[PDB]
Amino acid sequence: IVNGEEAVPGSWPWQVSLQDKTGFHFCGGSLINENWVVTAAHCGVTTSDVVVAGEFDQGSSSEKIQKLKIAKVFKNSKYNSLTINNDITLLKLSTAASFSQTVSAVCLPSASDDFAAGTTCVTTGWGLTRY
Amino acid sequence: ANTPDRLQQASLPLLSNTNCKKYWGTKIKDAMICAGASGVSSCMGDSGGPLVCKKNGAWTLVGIVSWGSSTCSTSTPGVYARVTALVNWVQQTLAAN
């Protein structure tokens, strides 16, 4: 995030990090419950990719994180490569997540919920702080 | 260069789709939602990430980082997958598995 702010460790329990076999963090994700994660369809996640939960400092060697394996990927078939519309993917874990203080789920809205423009929201992640 | 190690957070306002078209024209579909253009922006590595807002006490996933300015411009808004337009698909998926 550009101009973002270092968060309080553990204050965003559903935020997960997705990493490939080579170990690179390429996308973020959100736990909607113990067995599922929601991310972007364009992240092109595979079952050899790993979901890391409960982490704060990726450069730490002492924090207790949960490296969860992925059982199956479900990319919204409506996703369009040309328009990037319907950019969503659901991940079913093999290694269920164990919820607690630092690892929790985020809520899902209903199809009819309306979030008015001007509403102050929040976004988190391990994206570049400058491009 | 290299993705940051510590988790980052940022506050930002949502925009109506009509407003968003100001920056992205016809590339903004009904299944998307924009936020930002307020001195903050999502950058490489944040995609798939969450965009949460409060609804009676709880942070709800309103958006999922999707795409935006190629330079991570703080003067242009980022685009997100509008979860309300996708929750139906999500629900079906969780049931079929």
């Binding site: 702010e5 789920a105 929040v122 | -």
Partner: peptide, 11 residues
Amino acid sequence: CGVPAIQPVLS
């Protein structure tokens, strides 16, 4: 869901 056990602090 949505209620962090460790409350988030922003600026």
